[PDB]
């Protein structure tokens, strides 16, 4: 004889999806709406959060079908669109531009063909009157302006109405924490050699996630979280070439570079009540941007990556090659620095091959040497690969500089069916969501069901 | 000795007004934001919903003071405005037009004076440059600017700045459910001969409504629900001639037609990032859009509704007359057909008269005879019976053919005081809620009161 009893607060969970909310430390109470990511509205989490390790528990994880990443991507669209609406637009700027060679003062004849001194007719504070003006624009942002033209025009005039980024607000990657409401738990795997899919033997619960920073990149993941034990290779289908491969390093490579020039920040007025900013003049010598990476640091890193792919690709020769080419958005390493959008031609980084047998000791490589990466500046940017976005980056007075690590690489494989033996790995930003896939690979949202039923030997008493 | 007891969950309801949310069916999850009604956010109801047939209960219904249709109006204005915010505006189109007769190739002289070839100044993508462009505009959309001049202008230019329907979205009448929240129920009547006001002997409770499709019209109801027993004549005050009369037909009258012209869509650019689509040219001859109504199927419907009107108006001669006239919006049967707005005069439909005494056999009228209806196209549409915002209809790029069914008629009575004998009923779209009140007439939102008190012999037990 047994009876049914009810237990409340039981530790059982079921997989589902839910909406989350941001959370970050209130480091700066000042700088009103200066942060694009809106960290002011984020509630601080805890001076010492509660992290607790579960035992004797196995749970499966798969971030290739995770709603955690998909919610993050939908947010960044909304966060950017919210902060760009109260800004001036560049519609009156779309006029004929008279561009000529950039004049340099007394004090390189094959390298100065990047900036053009463009003159145009701009409306003054009164609509009827017009006064001529001058501005500097990059070669990548101008087109020959069709037939019967000895003059130039902006690239995105015939595509969509193109907006501008306000200078009062900044979009540095401040880390944020995505957190779940009451009754919702977020699980965290802890096995150091856990790839994309598989059960986790060290699952630990948490209130919510740790510091996650949104960094926009295409080929190399910057200033991210390092791996714990060794480099791990993550991919949904290794045998499928059309799917990208994420490489997560446990060692960081230092990449630093500048945009060496002082640019005068010139204020120009177009239309009644709208002002945009552009490059004023040149003081000194025009020098192209260039990013350096240490030879020994990069050469050593590619060796462990090559031999890590050797286990997943046995009896195969592994080599690294530059991008296929075509559109500039994905063939180069596009990253952020102070608010100026860069486009670095990454060709000398993947300038080697790996063999299963050989000698690759560090004493052979000469130290203090570095690889110079040519980069080009594009101040008019279309993001998310859609035809309806602008983010015009205003120039910043003085030369800019940045310091960041190298954490993750986005690789693609050719996989020729007739090709045998050697195989070629190329970098490519196939999907924008892949950047956040390297920080949400160990996280999963789950519901809590505090109701449990089981037979027992106790019976409910009835009053008589 | 009797004492009060408290009962919970009793079936007691009280009339109240509340908000309702959308609901739909998972017919197709494809396409990109194509649906104007936004059924993506509408929660699916149930593959087999729960309905309970109540009995022993009589409920009074009054749909003429119902908040269901009034709230359902408030959505339609919000859905239409929401889907037109990210769309281009036709402000630059307010330019002088050099219009003349259309040209037809080798291969009707009193039928082609409907569409006028027009040319105008057109700014290109660089704004400060104009090139001549041409398009075909309808007669109804142009005003000849000044007397004794061959130059025209758009009719809607001086009223209000107004935008264009984006081709990326569509607004076909998908059926939608509005479903009450928890704690509120919707009462459904089931008496076949139940007119607008009266008790209902077969009141049944449902979770929430069935499929209601939003269709806009002015004179005839299209693809609506069919009656069960017979034809019901409904009015708020039959003796008042200023209130419209809604007639519901249990027999479906099929109307099938098309606009017979294959016209290429031409993309015209009017500014930076702004483009609109207009008629390019005419291939073949020019023929007016016509619609067909079967003769035998029409007066057999009109004779049955003629008999039913005799009961409410005893021994009076019943005749149907064409619309009084005035503006085009309410004089003609305005409906939609694959995004094109039609305007057909119904002079060939409401022509005959009804005699209560006589013979009305079907064999007297010859079969295979259809009534032709002249229909005119107008792509500058203002609706809600007010001069507000446009909804510009783009070309079809082909030859659209759409098949529909006539559900009911919106009739009005002259109500002559000095006139005696004959009764004249004329169609009229005085208000457009009546297009939708024929679907929510058997529905009423009610609030549930689960508290009940009554004396009883039981007594509370007090500790001693």
């Amino acid at each position, epitope marked *: 004889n047994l009876w049914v009893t009810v237990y409340y607060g039981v530790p059982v969970w079921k997989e589902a999806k839910t909406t989350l909310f941001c959370a970050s430390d209130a480091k700066a109470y000042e700088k009103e709406v200066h942060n694009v990511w809106a960290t002011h509205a984020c509630v601080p989490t805890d001076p010492n959060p509660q992290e607790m390790v579960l035992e004797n528990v196995t749970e499966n994880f798969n971030m290739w079908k995770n709603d955690m990443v998909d919610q993050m991507h939908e947010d960044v669209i909304s966060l950017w669109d919210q902060s760009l609406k109260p800004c001036v637009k560049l519609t009156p700027l779309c006029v*004929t531009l008279n561009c000529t060679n950039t004049t340099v003062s007394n004090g390189s004849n094959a390298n100065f063909e990047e900036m053009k001194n463009c003159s145009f007719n701009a409306t003054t504070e009164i609509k*009827d*009157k*017009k006064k001529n003006e001058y501005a500097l624009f990059y070669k990548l942002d101008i087109v*020959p302006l*069709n*037939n*019967s*033209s*000895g003059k130039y025009r902006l690239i995105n005039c015939n595509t969509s109405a193109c907006t501008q980024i306000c200078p009062k607000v900044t979009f540095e990657p401040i880390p944020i924490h995505y957190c779940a409401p009451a009754g919702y738990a977020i699980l965290k795997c802890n096995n150091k050699t856990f790839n994309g899919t598989g059960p986790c033997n060290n699952v630990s619960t948490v209130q919510c996630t740790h510091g996650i920073k949104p960094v926009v990149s295409t080929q190399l993941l910057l200033n991210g979280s390092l791996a714990e034990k060794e480099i791990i290779i993550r991919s949904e289908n290794l045998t499928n070439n059309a799917k990208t491969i994420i490489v997560h390093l446990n060692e960081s490579v230092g990449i630093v570079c500048t945009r060496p020039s002082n640019m005068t920040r010139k204020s120009i007025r177009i239309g009644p009540g709208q002002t945009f900013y552009a490059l004023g003049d040149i003081i000194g010598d025009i020098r192209q941007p260039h990013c350096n990476i240490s030879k020994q640091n990069w050469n050593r890193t590619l060796q462990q990556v090559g031999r890590k792919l050797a286990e997943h690709f046995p009896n195969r020769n592994i080599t690294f090659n530059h991008s296929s080419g075509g559109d500039l958005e994905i063939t180069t390493h596009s990253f952020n620095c102070r608010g100026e959008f860069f486009y670095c031609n990454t060709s000398g980084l993947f300038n080697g091959t790996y063999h299963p047998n050989g000698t690759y000791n560090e004493t052979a490589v000469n130290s203090s040497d570095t690889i110079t990466l040519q980069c080009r500046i594009k101040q008019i940017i279309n993001m998310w690969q859609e035809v309806g976005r602008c983010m015009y980056a205003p120039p910043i007075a003085g030369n800019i500089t940045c310091n960041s690590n190298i954490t993750g690489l986005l690789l693609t494989r050719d996989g020729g069916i007739n090709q045998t033996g050697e195989e070629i790995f190329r970098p490519g930003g196939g999907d924008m969501r892949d950047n956040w896939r390297s920080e949400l690979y160990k996280y999963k949202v789950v519901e809590i069901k505090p109701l449990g039923i089981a037979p027992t030997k106790c019976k409910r008493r009835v009053v008589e | 000795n009797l004492w009060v007891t408290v009962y919970y969950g009793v079936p007691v309801w009280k009339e109240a007004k509340t908000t309702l949310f959308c609901a739909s069916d998972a017919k197709a999850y494809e396409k990109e934001v194509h649906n104007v009604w936004a059924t993506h956010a509408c929660v699916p109801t149930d593959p087999n919903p729960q309905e309970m047939v109540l009995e022993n209960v009589t409920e009074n219904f009054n749909m003429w003071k119902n908040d269901m249709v009034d709230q359902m109006h408030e959505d339609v204005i919000s859905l239409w405005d929401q889907s037109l915010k990210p769309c281009v505006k036709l402000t630059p189109l307010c330019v002088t037009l050099n219009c003349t007769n259309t040209t037809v190739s080798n291969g009707s002289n009193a039928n082609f004076e409907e569409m006028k070839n027009c040319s105008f*100044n057109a700014t290109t993508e660089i704004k*400060d*440059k*104009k*090139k*001549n462009e041409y398009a075909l505009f309808y007669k109804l959309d142009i005003v000849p600017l000044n007397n004794s001049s061959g130059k025209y202008r758009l009719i809607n230019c001086n009223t209000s700045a107004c935008t264009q329907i984006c081709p990326k979205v569509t607004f076909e009448p998908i059926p939608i459910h509005y479903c009450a929240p928890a704690g509120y129920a919707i009462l459904k009547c089931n008496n076949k001969t139940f007119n607008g006001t009266g008790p209902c002997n077969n009141v049944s409770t449902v979770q929430c409504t069935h499929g209601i499709k939003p269709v806009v019209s002015t004179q005839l109801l299209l693809n609506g629900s069919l009656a069960e027993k017979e034809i019901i004549i409904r009015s708020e005050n039959l003796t008042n001639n200023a209130k419209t009369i809604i007639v519901h037909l249990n027999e479906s009258v099929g109307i099938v037609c098309t606009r017979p012209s294959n016209m290429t869509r031409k993309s015209i650019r009017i500014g930076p990032g702004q483009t609109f689509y207009a008629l390019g040219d005419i291939i073949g001859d020019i023929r007016q859009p016509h619609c067909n109504i079967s003769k035998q199927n029409w007066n057999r419907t009109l004779q049955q509704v003629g008999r039913k009107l005799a009961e409410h108006f005893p021994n009076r001669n019943i005749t149907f007359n064409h619309s009084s006239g005035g503006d085009l919006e309410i004089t003609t049967h305005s409906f939609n057909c694959r995004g094109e707005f039609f305007y057909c005069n119904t002079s060939g439909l409401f022509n005959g008269t009804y005699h209560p005494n006589g013979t009305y056999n079907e064999t007297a009228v010859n079969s295979s005879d259809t009534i032709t209806l002249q229909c005119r196209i107008k792509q500058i549409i203002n609706m809600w019976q007010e001069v507000g915002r446009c909804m510009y209809a783009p070309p079809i790029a082909g030859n659209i053919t759409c098949n529909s069914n006539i559900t009911g008629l919106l009739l009005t009575r002259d109500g002559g005081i000095n006139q005696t004998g004959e009764e004249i009923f004329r169609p009229g779209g005085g208000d457009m809620r009546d297009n939708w009140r024929s679907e929510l007439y058997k529905y009423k939102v009610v609030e549930i009161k689960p508290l009940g008190i009554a004396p009883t012999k039981c007594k509370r037990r007090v500790v001693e």
Partner: antibody
Amino acid sequence: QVQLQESGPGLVRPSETLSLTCTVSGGSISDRYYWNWIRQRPGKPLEWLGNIYGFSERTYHNPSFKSRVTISKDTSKNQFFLSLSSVTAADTAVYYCVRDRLLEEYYEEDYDNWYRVFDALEVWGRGLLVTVSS
Amino acid sequence: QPVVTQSPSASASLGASVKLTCTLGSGNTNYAIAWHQQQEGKAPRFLMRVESGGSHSKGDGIPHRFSGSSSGAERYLTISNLQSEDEADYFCQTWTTGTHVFGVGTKL
């Protein structure tokens, strides 16, 4: 269609200057936009001297040459002239007056000030035998 | 002022089909051209207008045996069914916004 007939002092014994005329048949000079002038000397390739507009009177004289060419508008009686000062003995040439094609593309220097893009030479017609000798 | 060059003369046999060309040279080669024909005295004639994509614009009384094509900085003109009266001087000119440069032409 339009027809162009030219008349004037083709035979000039005293070489001081030269004045020419082109009557226009059909479309008025005021309407239908641009009109042109073309020189042709016996042995060397033809050259362009200047330009005249129909509506706005925007004269695009040849930038290579200095102020040596003048164009009259004469919109009253459907006419346009040509006068060149200080004719040289090497200026012995045949003149052709031209109407241009309709490519309606209008640019803009100042507010409410438009002008049409130049177009290919379309009609052309006959000629006058000129022998400037002294 | 784009400058166009051309071969001084062309050699062909009677009754065959001539392939007349003139080369375009400038900093920007995007400027369009328009062919002409110069007979012996009287008045030369305008034939057709060329644009990007081979937009044929034969205006006044031009048969369908005057096709043309473009290949980089040089454009090809194809003439079929030659006659005795078809020999003349053909000029290719540019437009810009002034300084009509004209062409040297080729005499057969």
